[PDB]
């Protein structure tokens, strides 16, 4: 348990409903949540079950006027996760609306969240939850086959971001090597009594 | 019932190289090199003996134990493909209109292309593109025969199936109209 300014969550490898429940509880408790890479979220079960559920969703519309009052079918993966979250919050109240304003959802990782720490939720992670052999699908693939138009643009932007992250990781590895060398070199120059005092304290 | 341990063994010939990493099996031989991603199947690969690959499943059900036989046969087919190869001989027969088969190789894509003309007098030109790594030749020993050879059994058999299915007779009695291209022989190149 910890209180943060905002929690940025990598949405890759997470289950939709469990992540939505945990995020909704955090929002109602008062924690600001940003979720990135919503196109990489996971739904348990085979893909045609999710496709059938979204087509059954697409069936429903206000009969006398589809421009007002009807279920507006948002095809984007971030919007699908937002719908899952909003179904778990009393959104028609002022408190629920205020809890919804504490949430941001995106496809990919737009800046400046690409240079921020992304956390994971182990209670929603698919490798930690699903039984081996059970099938699962991708919310981004579902979105692409129900009409989302920006799978390729997000993929190209993610490749560019990953190349820049690879360069940053090369610099980070160089810095880590230099830090280890610095500690090894300075270990001879620290006062010995300081050294065994810190060692006995556990540092 | 979950079975505590189950295992299978695949022998490897002397001139065959096998490399498995993250369930990506690469098999290289005299005829070439093949790859197959088996990451959708839970299996532990090991080298139980010199020239023998061991496949293990731990605490698996009957379905999971039975999948190892399919994995074994797939890897053995890759080994046979890179050692001896695979060859499908097809025959095209006709009653009145002679079927004209032209085989070319597309330089840009590197794949073979088969054009079929005069199938029961039709004016359309059927075009079927082979999978990469599959070579098609018009046979010289026998009459009206194509030969499809390669290292991938799946690619060779699927190319043969596409050629067989492109020449389908529609809205005619099949007891009377016997025209078409059929797989006449399956075997190894060597």
């Amino acid at each position: 348990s910890s209180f943060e300014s905002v929690v940025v969550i990598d949405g890759k490898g997470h289950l939709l409903g469990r992540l939505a429940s945990i995020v909704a509880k955090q929002l109602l408790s008062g924690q600001k949540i940003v979720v990135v890479r919503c196109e990489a979220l996971n739904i348990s079960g085979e893909f045609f079950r999710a496709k059938l559920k979204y087509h059954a969703y697409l069936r429903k519309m206000t009969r006398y006027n589809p421009t007002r009052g009807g279920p507006f079918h948002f095809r984007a993966p971030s919007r699908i996760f937002y719908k899952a979250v909003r179904g778990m919050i009393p959104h028609k109240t002022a408190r629920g609306a205020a809890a919804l304003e504490r949430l941001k959802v995106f496809e990919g990782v737009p800046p400046p969240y690409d240079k921020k720490k992304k956390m994971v939720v182990p209670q929603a992670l698919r490798v930690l939850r699903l039984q081996p052999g059970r099938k699962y699908c991708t919310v981004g693939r579902l979105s692409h086959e129900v009409g989302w138009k920006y799978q390729d643009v997000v993929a190209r932007l993610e490749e560019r971001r990953k190349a820049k992250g690879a360069a940053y990781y090369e610099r980070k590895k160089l810095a880590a090597r230099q830090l280890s060398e610095a500690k090894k070199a300075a270990a001879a120059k620290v006062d010995p009594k300081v050294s065994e005092a810190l060692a006995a304290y556990g540092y | 019932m979950r079975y505590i341990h189950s295992e299978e063994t695949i022998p490897v010939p002397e001139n065959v190289k096998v490399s498995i990493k993250s369930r990506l099996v690469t098999v290289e031989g005299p005829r070439g090199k093949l790859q197959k991603d088996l990451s959708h199947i839970a299996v532990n690969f090991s080298v139980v003996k010199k020239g023998v690959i061991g496949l293990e499943i731990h605490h698996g059900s009957r379905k999971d134990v039975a999948a190892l036989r399919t994995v074994r046969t797939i890897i053995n087919n890759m080994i046979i493909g890179v050692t001896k190869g695979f060859k499908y001989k097809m025959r095209y027969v006709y009653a009145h209109f002679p079927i004209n088969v032209n085989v070319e190789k597309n330089a840009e894509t590197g794949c073979y292309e088969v054009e079929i003309r005069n199938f029961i007098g039709e004016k359309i030109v059927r075009k079927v593109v082979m999978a990469p790594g599959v070579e098609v030749e018009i046979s010289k020993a026998q009459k009206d025969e194509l030969i499809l050879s390669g290292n991938s059994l799946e690619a060779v058999s699927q190319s043969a199936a596409d050629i067989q299915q492109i020449c389908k007779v529609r809205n005619k009695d099949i007891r009377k109209f016997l025209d078409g291209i059929y797989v006449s022989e399956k075997g190894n190149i060597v």
Binding site: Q26, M119, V120, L125, V127 | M1, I4, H5, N44, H58
Partner: protein, 174 residues
């Protein structure tokens, strides 16, 4: 069905002028406590010897403890259970360190695999298999195999449920 114990329950019919020394009857009852043990004992005597509770008495109730609870043993359980088709025999095998543990595992197993409750199951015999060759079921024959040793693939690590967020993705290799 619960933290069971084995009770030796001995009872009899009340002495009369015609029968001054009635016979004693002993059963082994797997029950959560002594009240349930005596109730099951009187139910079984009503089913078998037509001796009612009002015309009988309990002579003794004792607890039978396992002789070697630190020894791994194989148990064969012969039981009869009731479904809507009727009563059916069943022989099953359980690998435990005590008869009471074998009986609770049997109750959970019948509940899971045949939806049988406590009232519909009659425990007819619980025996400890003296030799390895007495083991019949393959799911115990694989466990009594020679030099048994297995790995544990795909172990989900224990993470506290109060720790919502983690900075690193976990691993399933230990």
């Amino acid at each position: 069905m619960g933290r069971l114990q084995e009770y030796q329950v001995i009872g009899r019919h009340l002495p009369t002028e015609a029968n001054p020394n009635p016979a004693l009857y002993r059963m082994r009852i797997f029950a959560p406590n002594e009240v349930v043990a005596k109730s099951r004992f009187w139910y079984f005597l009503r089913g078998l010897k037509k001796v009612k509770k009002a015309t009988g008495e309990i002579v003794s109730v004792n607890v039978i403890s396992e002789k070697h609870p630190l020894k791994v043993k194989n148990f064969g359980i012969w039981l009869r259970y009731d479904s809507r088709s009727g009563t059916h025999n069943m022989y099953k095998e359980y690998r435990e360190t005590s008869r009471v543990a074998a009986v609770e595992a049997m109750y959970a197993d019948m509940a899971a695999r045949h939806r049988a409750r406590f009232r519909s199951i009659h425990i007819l015999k619980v025996v400890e298999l003296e030799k390895t060759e007495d083991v019949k079921r393959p799911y115990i024959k694989q466990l009594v195999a020679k030099n048994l040793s297995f790995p544990l693939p795909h172990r989900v690590p224990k993470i506290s449920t109060k720790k919502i967020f983690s900075a690193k993705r976990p691993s399933t290799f230990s």
